Amino acid sequence: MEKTHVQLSLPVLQVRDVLVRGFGDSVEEVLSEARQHLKDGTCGLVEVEKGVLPQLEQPYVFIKRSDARTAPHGHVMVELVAELEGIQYGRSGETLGVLVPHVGEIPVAYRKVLLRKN
Ligand SMILES: Nc1ccc2sccc2c1
């Protein structure tokens, strides 16, 4: 049925190219839509630099590194943590980026992850 982890290659997008700048309007919604878009292959990743977060829509969904030992074929193990008004629901490791819908924008790279589905 549903393995706990799935290997994915996510398109990395520059923030100014992103057309849909968040997944929804609550913490529960953004996590739910992030997971659906991951399942459908319509999820992109924006790497965080200065000025990136203010250009995206809260609540944010981050992918964070969940394990230090495991990266099969560079698929870094990650889990999802959401943020609303400065509070994060969950705790994990280093932030690898912020997830956004992908609607056909051209990426600058692909990031390989081993995603904890829940
Ligand atoms: N195949 C696939 C890819 C990503 C995700 S996220 C939750 C379920 C799921 C399934």
Residue numbers in the entry: 9 to 126
Quoted passage from the original study:
Here, the aim was to unambiguously identify the binding orientations of fragment hits for SARS-CoV-2 nonstructural protein 1 (nsp1) which contain a combination of sulfur and/or chlorine, bromine and iodine substituents. We chose SARS-CoV-2 nsp1 as a model system because its crystals routinely diffract to high resolution, fragments can easily be soaked in without compromising crystal quality and several hundred data sets are at our disposal. Nine new nsp1-binding fragment analogues containing sulfur and/or halogen substituents were selected for this study. Finally, we demonstrate that the integration of anomalous difference Fourier maps and PanDDA offers a reliable and effective strategy for fitting fragments into challenging electron density with a high degree of confidence.
1E7 and 7G3 share the same ring scaffold, benzothiophene, with a single substituent at distinct positions. For 1E7, an amine is positioned para to the sulfur, while a more flexible acetic acid substituent is located in the meta position to the sulfur in 7G3, which may explain the missing density for this substituent. Overall, the anomalous sulfur signal from the cysteine, methionine and sulfur-containing fragment analogues (1E7, 7G3, 6A6, 11A7, 11A7_AL5 and 11A7_AL6) cannot be observed consistently, probably due to the low anomalous contribution to the structure factor f′′ (0.2 e) of sulfur at 12.8 keV, which is far from the sulfur absorption edge.
